[PDB]
Amino acid sequence: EKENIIGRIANLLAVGFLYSESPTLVDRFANALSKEAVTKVLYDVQRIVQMGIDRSEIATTTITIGKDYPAVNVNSSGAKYTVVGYLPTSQDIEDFLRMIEEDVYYARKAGALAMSIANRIKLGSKQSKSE
Amino acid sequence: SEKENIIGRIANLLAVGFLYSESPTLVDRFANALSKEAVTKVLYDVQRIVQMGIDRSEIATTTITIGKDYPAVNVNSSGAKYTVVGYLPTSQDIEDFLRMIEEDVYYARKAGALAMSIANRIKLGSKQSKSEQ
Amino acid sequence: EKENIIGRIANLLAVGFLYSESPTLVDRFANALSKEAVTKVLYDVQRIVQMGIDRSEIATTTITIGKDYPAVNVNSSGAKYTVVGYLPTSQDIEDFLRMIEEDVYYARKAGALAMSIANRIKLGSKQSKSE
Amino acid sequence: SEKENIIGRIANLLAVGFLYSESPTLVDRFANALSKEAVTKVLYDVQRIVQMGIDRSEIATTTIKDYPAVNVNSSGAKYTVVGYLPTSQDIEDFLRMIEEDVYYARKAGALAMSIANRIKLG
Amino acid sequence: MISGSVRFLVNLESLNGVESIGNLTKHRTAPVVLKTSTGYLVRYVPVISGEALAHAYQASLVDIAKKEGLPVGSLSSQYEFIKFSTDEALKIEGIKEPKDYNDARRFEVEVMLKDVIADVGGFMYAGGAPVRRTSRIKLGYMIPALRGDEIPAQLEAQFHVRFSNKPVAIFNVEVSSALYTFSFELDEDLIAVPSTFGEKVKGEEELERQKAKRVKSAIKALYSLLSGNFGGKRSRFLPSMKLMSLVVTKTDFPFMPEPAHDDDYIKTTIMRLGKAKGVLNGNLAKAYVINNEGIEVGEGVTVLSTVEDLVVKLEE
Amino acid sequence: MISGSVRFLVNLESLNGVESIGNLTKHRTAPVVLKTSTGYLVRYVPVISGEALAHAYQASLVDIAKKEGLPVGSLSSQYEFIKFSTDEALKIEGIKEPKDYNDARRFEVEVMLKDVIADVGGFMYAGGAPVRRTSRIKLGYMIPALRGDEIPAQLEAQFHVRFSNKPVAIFNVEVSSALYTFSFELDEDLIAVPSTFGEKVKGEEELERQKAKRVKSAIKALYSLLSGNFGGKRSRFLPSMKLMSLVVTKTDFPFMPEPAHDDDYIKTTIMRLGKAKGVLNGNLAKAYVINNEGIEVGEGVTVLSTVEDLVVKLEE
Amino acid sequence: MIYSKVFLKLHWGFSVVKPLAKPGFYLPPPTTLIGALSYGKFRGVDNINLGNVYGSPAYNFRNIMATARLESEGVYTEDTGKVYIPNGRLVVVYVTDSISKEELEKLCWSITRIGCKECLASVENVEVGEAKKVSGRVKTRYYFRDTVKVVGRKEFLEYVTFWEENGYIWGKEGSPVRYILPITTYPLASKEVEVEAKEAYEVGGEYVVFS
DNA sequence: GGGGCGGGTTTTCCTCGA
Asked: Are E229 and E52 in contact (CB under 8 A)?
């Protein structure tokens, strides 16, 4: 369940990064040495995602990868991205903050996963444009 | 085995990062790692170097005929051209590799040894072709 | 092709021994009873060779022995040595490790060849200094 | 019969190490060995002593027909052991002989002590 | 009868020495041949002889018997088990030598009444009319198990020095650590029974009365062997023993368990006990097993926890 | 008898040394056989010899005897325990060598009325009439606990330099850290009692008079071993020691507590003590336990706090 | 003529010292094999009146034919000669007609040691049957007498001296009889030898040669 | 719009005695 929480936080960070086109929040999250820095990023990334939701540029969907998987569609600057997985719940944020209060290592783990998701999606999108 | 394929793809990532940066420092850190922290830090830093090479169009995926087409990565560094044969790791390969490291840090040494072998063979071949020309 | 791989591994061990002036890695290789010991030596010897390459004290060359043969020049402590042959490729290391996973005997064979190369070169270098 | 040549070259190494260190302890350990572990440990330790003598230029190969020899300088004494030192292949083939029969370590130890005694007497 | 197979684990031990060479004390080793894919390998493995165990058992029996008032010989009260062998030994105790063959039994009984150790341990008298008595306890050599493709035993030399203020002081001792296994046999039914044909001689009623006490003492003496009170060099090289597996069989007919050289030696001995009882028309057959290494046991066996319970059940 | 098992935790330790190679001082290492879920394995682990413990115990006994007025030998007054092995020691002390076997007892008494160390720790004289006396205190090698699959021990080398204004001074020292365990045995019922068989000899009355004081001193001498005053290189490598678990058993019959290798070795040894007292027809069996790690102990067991209380209780 | 086979598992080995330095034998003599069989019936008694002198409780089974052979590898070492073959297997063949099948089978399960006390040996399995007599050329592994001829290559033959049953009595030395052993000296093992002979009993393919 | 460049260490000692 700890890995599932970390994976859902990583999906939130990856969606926020792909939508904003800025690594700054993921950099802040992966370099955090206090609960203050982690919590500030968790707010700021959700505030970016909230704007994308209100603009209908961020939406939940299902995608067939032959069973349907939960996904998040992100439209940014005319690029379309799809992140596979769920976004964190309020309980996931609270349980993740409790994990951070024990060990800030979990912020680095979530940041490393988020950057991996974003890099793979950006590479695939650039390859399809070149073809 | 799927574990060997993951290790081989991590070794390709480390070799691409080494050839592009011209620095062994990340491979040295990876092969000497005694904790998951050191391994994960190198996996980020090498991918960050590869990301810059991708954005500059100095790192690109390609196919090469060695008579079937094999996946490869072209690397341009300091006017030298290198070609690493194989795939780069997926996000799932990084995650499964980190789980292997959480069980046994030996797999970081195995990937580092393979990465240095790939880089050494490519550097030797590139120096020989320059001496002949 | 197995003998060619073993010969290229023996050349790597001989170059590492002549450059480091230490038999310790060849001793470890020839006494190996596990893939762990063999793989550790293959890394450590290549790490020594990498330092010699960066210092330009180890270089590939050709030598006429009337056709040109591939060779490796080694400069150590003001002594000059020349090992005749190629260094192993990444594929040779991988195929050699597969041979070791079947039978650790091949590490003893490569170690015996490496020590023979190094001994012949050291004897010739001492004779020329005495003359 | 190269087996006798290998044993003779190992005995020369042990005799050089004994004359340079002025200690019989490694030859005693070699001649009393009951396992490959004890033999291999002595083969390392004697070569490590010889390596120090080489680095100090107190152990050198020479010729003395001309025969191959090893000059040893220890505590102002000069000794000359006639013969070759073992190759890496001789050590490996000798270790294979020891894995079959530890008797060959006793044979090499007896020869090494005979070489050292004859040189010390002279 | 009683039969037993026991597995031991000993670390940093030197109990049975051998002839000293120079300034070195050496351990007792034996050669074994091990099978490999390449071929065969000859390896020297430490062992412990079967005489030290007998000496320890006899000493423990003497100590137990002297507490209960059973007769003990003069030279056997001192820990010197020469026994009634030659004329000089008989002179101290005060026993007349046998006259001829026909009187031999009588002599035995007299000896059998003047020393318990000569009864259970057995004795031999050389002379014109020799008399014999086979030991009631049989012990074997202690050799570590040759299981799998690896021998779990080592042997190293340790260097020791004595300090003096006026140097003018050096010795070496061999130490080992192995996984030992040994088996033994005892026949409590033949205790206090003469072993020579003839006519009954006056004095056998005392032996009949003392049979129960002698049997109880002989059974009790096994506790010392099963607890690890054997060997020498215990003042400065006291070992560290431990019990792993133990099988003890009590029957009314000859039988022995399998050697403890394999990982599964209790199931085999239980099946063989059943098969042998089937053919030899036995009546009593009981097996007690103590297991600590978690190997397969089987069905139809009482499981104990310590060695004291085993001795209690054997005595009962 | 008094039998004890003790567990210690030591960090940054070097008390025992062996032969040196080059500029490196090595720590004693021994092979151990350990059981894991995959079978049995052989490892090399640092150890400490028991001779250092014996020397520390004998030195403390010398100090206590000198303080309490008990006689101490001339050579043993200085911390050199050659005892009476060679003829030079006999000449220095001034004791005539034994003439024949019948005189041996007399010689033993003469040795026994001059030095308490010879009485307690035993001695040997080799010659025409050899004389032997086994030590009354038995110790063993100090081995870390072989618990689980990972050995809680580590060894490394450290670098040191000597300063000089005119370079023309570099050495290495081995340092270990482990959780050691060891056991000891001491039979106080044979202190101040001659061991060689023979007739009565004048001078035994003094031994009978001094028996109580000798026993008290021998019991007191264990405080140094139980506290941690042993080993060398204490001037610059003083170790950090901390007691973790201690079991002491006082019995009138032979007994051996379980080694401190498993986490549950107090309940087992208490149950074994009870059953052994039941089966061996004993009359005294007491146990004392000191626990500081919160492991299972049992019921009806006296619990102490320090070691001085244990020493006082043993003396009383 | 009935025959019986027994399979024994040895604990550490056997030790029999030569009569008249205490060198030992390589394989047990037939006297020890007969005594081991007789132990099953004469247990507990050490001296029986043969009629003229007390010599042994074994002077009655003297006419039972017995042979034995190894099935593993061992080493002969003097340190009192001993033959170390731990965990090895021994195959013993008894051929006789004095008693019926039942008695021989019952006595076959009652073997406890071969040689001295320490040489314990468990019993794994037995077989009982009727044997047939032949005289043609056969191949055998069991040791036989010296007078038997040989057709194959003399490469794995050794000579030993054994004694008859006359030595069962104390204070008297048995007659000397030569015997040929098809054994390799180092390491210890058994090899097949082809012999013609005159009398050979087939006890299951492994022909046993007696004369 | 996803930075650039110059630096990746130099001596000195490698055990003494029973």
From this structure: no
